[PDB]
Amino acid sequence: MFYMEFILSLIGSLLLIICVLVSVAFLTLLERKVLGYIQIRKGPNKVGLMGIPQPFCDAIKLFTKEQTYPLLSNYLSYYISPIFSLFLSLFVWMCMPFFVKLYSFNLGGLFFLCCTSLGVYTVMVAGWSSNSNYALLGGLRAVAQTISYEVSLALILLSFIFLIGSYNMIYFFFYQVYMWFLIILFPMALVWVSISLAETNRTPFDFAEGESELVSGFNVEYSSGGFALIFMAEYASILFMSMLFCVIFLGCDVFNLLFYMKLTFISFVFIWVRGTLPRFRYDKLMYLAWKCFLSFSLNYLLFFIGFKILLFSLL
Amino acid sequence: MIMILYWSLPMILFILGLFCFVSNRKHLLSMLLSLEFIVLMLFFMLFIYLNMLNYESYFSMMFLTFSVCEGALGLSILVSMIRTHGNDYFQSFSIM
Amino acid sequence: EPKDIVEVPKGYVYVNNKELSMEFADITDRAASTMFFGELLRGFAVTLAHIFKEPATINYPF
Amino acid sequence: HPAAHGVLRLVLELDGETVMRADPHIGLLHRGTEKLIEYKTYTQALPYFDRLDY
Amino acid sequence: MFSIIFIALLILLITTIVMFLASILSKKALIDREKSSPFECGFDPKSSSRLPFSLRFFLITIIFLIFDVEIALILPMIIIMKYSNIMIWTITSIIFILILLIGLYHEWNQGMLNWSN
Amino acid sequence: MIQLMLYSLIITTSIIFLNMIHPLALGLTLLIQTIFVCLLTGLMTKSFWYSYILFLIFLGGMLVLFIYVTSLASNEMFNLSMKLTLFSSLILIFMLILSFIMDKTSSSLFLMNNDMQSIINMNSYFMENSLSLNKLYNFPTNFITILLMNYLLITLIVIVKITKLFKGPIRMM
Amino acid sequence: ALTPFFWLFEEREKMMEFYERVSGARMHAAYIRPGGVSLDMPLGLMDDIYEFASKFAERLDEVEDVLTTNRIWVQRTEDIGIVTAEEALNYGFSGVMLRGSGIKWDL
Amino acid sequence: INRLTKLFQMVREAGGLKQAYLKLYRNDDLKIGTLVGIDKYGNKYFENPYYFYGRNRWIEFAPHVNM
Amino acid sequence: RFLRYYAHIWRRQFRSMPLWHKGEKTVKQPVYVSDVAQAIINAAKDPDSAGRIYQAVGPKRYQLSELVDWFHRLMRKDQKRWGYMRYDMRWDPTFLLKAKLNSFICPGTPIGGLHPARIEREAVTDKVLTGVPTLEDLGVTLTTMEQQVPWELRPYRAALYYDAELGEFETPSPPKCIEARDELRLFA
Amino acid sequence: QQTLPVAEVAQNLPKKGYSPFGTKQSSVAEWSLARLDDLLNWGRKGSIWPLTFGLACCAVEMMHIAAPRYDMDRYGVVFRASPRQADVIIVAGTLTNKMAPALRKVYDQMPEPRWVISMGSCANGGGYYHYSYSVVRGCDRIIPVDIYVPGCPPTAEALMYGVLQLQKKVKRMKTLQMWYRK
Ligand SMILES: COC1=C(OC)C(=O)C(C/C=C(\C)CC/C=C(\C)CC/C=C(\C)CC/C=C(\C)CC/C=C(\C)CC/C=C(/C)CC/C=C(\C)CC/C=C(\C)CCC=C(C)C)=C(C)C1=O
Ligand code: SF4
């Protein structure tokens, strides 16, 4: 009865947690193979059998390796920031729509907006806590990212929301039963991927890491334990944001198998782009968000305010 | 009393907000930090009263809009502070 | 084709010499790519194409 | 730093991210090549030039 | 909510256990005065990271606070479209988005969106 | 029940907040409290719509002041206060003890949750936030929203004029 | 950008077989000498030099497609590091730095 | 489209899935080639022009080594 | 395991320092390790030094209370701000439990060098015999603690993230050695 | 030099087995540690992360090991920038005096267990500039070295062979099995 109900909710979260945690390990392998094939390389192929156990073969090393205690760092902050980076990455999954109920989440769309914003503090605190010049530049390079994508992100979500009528993610299924919103929203799909990259701090928007501009960005002063969680928390973001693209533009048939064939493909796209584009320039992004994306997104609210109004009169 | 069982806690929190807004901290930002602390508590009470009404919580948005502007304006004045004094310390201002 | 800003002598090649046309037929063509990620599109076709090649790796030491 | 090619030491004067002054500290790869050449026959000195502009 | 809080705590405990395993599973060696020194490309650092870091997007930084608080007023739109008067809802919404665009284009034309130079 | 424990934590975090000196210590204290107040407000309401909004609004303000803290008050100090840790921990457990032995039907707030409403209330069967946010965009209160718009846009003109971007960056000279 | 590094260093690997095949070292051939080169080319090298050259145009086109017209690539390079012609001469500049700014000079 | 027919063949000279797996586990690849010769120490040398130049000639190490 | 055994987190109790008798009945003659190593080698180069006993002690004698105060001044861990304070180890039994627990739990090596065997080393006062040769007989020139310790504890300093201006931390006062006569009175 | 076994003699030798400790442990506790010691070594062996030092003209041949022809990444070797996450350092080039304090520090910042590879003659023994007035005569003067890869520059395969030697050296560590005896 009701007492039993919440037990199942625990199982689902734990089941979803271990499954996501496992997948991000295998995603990292997939990233190396695919990125190893776009480049004419072969990719990890020796370890174990045909390279499949590679990511596990790395999780051993990052945990048998010593913690680093930076001399000039506020140790408690430096030590805790990895936890909340991983926690916020996993926690945002509880809003992922299931028809076999996991959590109701009316206003689920907002819950996305709150959680994704939090992911910046963990980078921000980690960089400042490390107390290294590069780490601080990485942190403040990450914050400036939020100032850019944050506002445009909400508006673009609002456009999708107008189509469905509510902030509950479940309704995306019903409206994408005949077709896919990709057709109606092609430029937004293309724009949305672009902002999605900023969310997860990937090439061409890789500024928090800032590899080859900063030595390793805000991660420059992390090691075995802390660095691992920072890494996993990174790829959990990709996996979710890839899924959130599949529920919005690609049917949202969560109970069908193909939905998971789609989910991996969008994950491939994220790796695919990393092997194509050079990194933007730190300012060109912020100009891009405010000069083009923000103006672009507002323009279609009118287009969808008119379209919904026009459609309302007929129906 | 009703006011003690339901409205005491937010008020006690509010006055603690003010006592932050007046205590002696070197940096002007310490005032801004405590500024939106108080606003957070004002929202809490205002949200108690608005919910005594069945459907009037929409006014929360009205309050939040003025909350950010005073913070946003409060932050602008700090910027103008820097580019005349060079620093925001309270003890750097002429005591008058 | 647009013209060259600087006339070219013999035995020399210029890299950025052609000017930009201002005919609507061309501005729209530039605009369309600038507006639908057209330049990046062919960049993505090329990289994906390399998935379908034999990688040049050697199975050292065998 | 990876972009420095393991030799360069730019002592930048950063006003935020913008650079106001750059001091290219050089000599991290000074191997007194031109003094060794003074001790070597012409043929023995030919390999030294493979190393310059490697 | 109360379900979510419980799982929020349960996850936080789980992730916390992960480093508490890492901190013990980690190889332990004597810490050196140089091992814990900061990383700044192998040369000692001139400047603490806690010096004042100049800012150039300060103006955008403030504008970001504003533009969000208008996101609080567009989000409710959808929820109240079936229930509101269409003229009032239509008129007000438009003159909400035109006001935003006009504000943006005004500053863009004034060059405030550009960074300090 | 957790409402009382939320009362204890918001009190506890407020006591320490009075004693913070380092700006980031203030910020961390404030950020933690913004979570609780956001959580607490949704308990006594028909929906958490406003907690989402409030949380989102303040997080915008949280980032910006770090950017200025990291530029103005970058070099400052912390001091663990054994008086403070004991005092908060002492009262915190003390307060938590009461919440277990409290007549927590009496401590619950009389504000009507969505379930607290009757079954006959026909207006409670619509969308979660339809009616409440409704007259924000209907005659005559809509003009208030319009008034904000100018107020916000006119604000946007105030910051650029106070700021005077062209006369340089900001440094803690 | 990463792929151009690998798409080109694959051709670079083929090219340093010709160094290895005439001199015996993939790098630092020590082949050119004051009296002329130190050995004749191996029999049949020139056929393989042709074979590499015949295919090298395609390799450079693919990198060009991904880089030259890329919108991001232009922004990361355009108007960054301008060298006016009169500045360059005074500086002892040479090579592409000299011809980058329009001077028609090639030793 | 028809690599399976090659794949089944690789198994047959391998000696069934059991010996095929150990081959894959050891050499990290399954390749068809003609035994050119056998050295004094048991290493078997294969060749197949089908593959491109670098991978054209390969060696099987003696079984007793095993890693 | 001497300048770290007193700077470690385990040795403290949240800011404190349980010392036997507050360390005021313990007198020590610590010697810099390099001087000891020099003694070993010098004894190796010489055959005259064979078959004899040598005592390797520093140049000065300090009360254990006096030393630990000086470290925490060097480490910027002064009582005024940091909150350092000295128990008497006999008063608190919690500390002895920590060692007993610490020894048992750790399989490889005690953490913070803390274990009951190490405690007894601290309590016992150095007893340099008269008439046994010292390293000065071997030609070693002993380094004083004031020369070396202030550089040993630089990486253990508290609030090391500060970037202090010059003069914002005042140079600590040196420790006061214990005169030979004073040791008679100190021990009654 | 110990020559390899003849085929007929080798035709009798038993299969080597994976672990270099064999399965001949007397007790359960020893045997479990031995197997558990393999698990560590299998981990560290698999993913060896160089630091991207790249000092001098060995550095170029340290790029071609990552090039598609040889593909260091096939072996789990992944280049990294920060010395904190880096596990191995490949000192490839001429370590001059001006650099020497910088290498020492960068090596120190690397967390244990850290292995060093010396590439080319320059980093091995000073190489072609052995007698120069501003060259450290081999990096082993400054940091411990675990593998020496000769060459000038070492061929790409030569370095690959060096890396595999480091995997085998890692594979046979006795970090746990020696704790038991300790
Ligand atoms: C040379 O030029 C070049 C450069 O210039 C320098 C480059 O920078 C680069 C840069 C390359 C990149 C940026 C590539 C992307 C790679 C990175 C950013 C980092 C490298 C690391 C990886 C790819 C590995 C990915 C994985 C991780 C880092 C760890 C993540 C955490 C994981 C996998 C753990 C998951 C958790 C789980 C519970 C999974 C299931 C269980 C386990 C792991 C348990 C394991 C074992 C046990 C518990 C033992 C139990 C035993 C018993 C009971 C007996 C290249 C390619 C280059 O060519
Ligand atoms: S060893 Fe040879 S190839 Fe390597 S850096 Fe020195 S001169 Fe160059």
Author numbering:
A (entry chain H): 1 to 315
B (entry chain K): 1 to 96
C (entry chain I): 32 to 93
D (entry chain D): 93 to 146
E (entry chain A): 1 to 117
F (entry chain J): 1 to 173
G (entry chain D): 201 to 307
H (entry chain q): 7 to 73
What sentences appear in the manuscript?
Respiratory complex I powers ATP synthesis by oxidative phosphorylation, exploiting the energy from NADH oxidation by ubiquinone to drive protons across an energy-transducing membrane. Here, we isolate complex I from Drosophila and determine its structure, revealing a 43-subunit assembly with high structural homology to its 45-subunit mammalian counterpart, including a hitherto unknown homologue to subunit NDUFA3. Cryo-EM particle classification identified three distinct states in our preparation of Drosophila complex I, which we refer to as Dm1, Dm2, and Dm3.
Our cryo-EM analyses revealed the major class of enzyme particle (Dm1) in the active resting state, with all the characteristics of the mammalian active state enzyme. The Dm1 class is the dominant class, containing ~60% of the particles, whereas the two minor classes, Dm2 and Dm3, each contain ~20%. In the Dm1 state of Drosophila complex I, these features are all unambiguously in the active state. First, ND6-TMH3 is clearly α-helical, it does not contain the π-bulge that is characteristic of the deactive state, and ND1-TMH4 is clearly in the ‘bent’ conformation of the active state (with Tyr149 pointing toward the E-channel), not the straight conformation of the deactive state (with Tyr149 pointing away from the E-channel). Second, the densities for the NDUFS2-β1−β2 loop that carries the His97 ligand to bound ubiquinone, the ND3-TMH1−2 loop that carries Cys41 (the biochemical marker of the mammalian active/deactive states), and the ND1-TMH5−6 loop, are all well-defined in the Dm1 density map and their conformations match the mammalian active-state conformations (they are not disordered as in the deactive state). Importantly, as expected from the ordered states of the loop structures that form the ubiquinone-binding site, the site is sealed and closed from the matrix as in the mammalian active state, not open to the matrix as in the deactive state. Indeed, density for Q9 is observed within the site, although the Q9 is only partially inserted, with its ubiquinone-headgroup in the central section of the channel, rather than ligated to the two proton-donor ligands NDUFS2-His97 and NDUFS2-Tyr146 as required for its reduction. Contacts between the NDUFS4 N-terminal ‘tether’ and subunits NDUFA5 and NDUFA10 of 182 and 427 Å2, respectively, further stabilise the interface and, by extension, the relative disposition of the hydrophilic and membrane domains in the Drosophila Dm1 active state. In Dm1, the tail of a phosphatidylcholine molecule is intercalated into the structure, sterically obstructing the rotation of bulky residues on ND6-TMH3 around the helical axis to form the π-bulge.
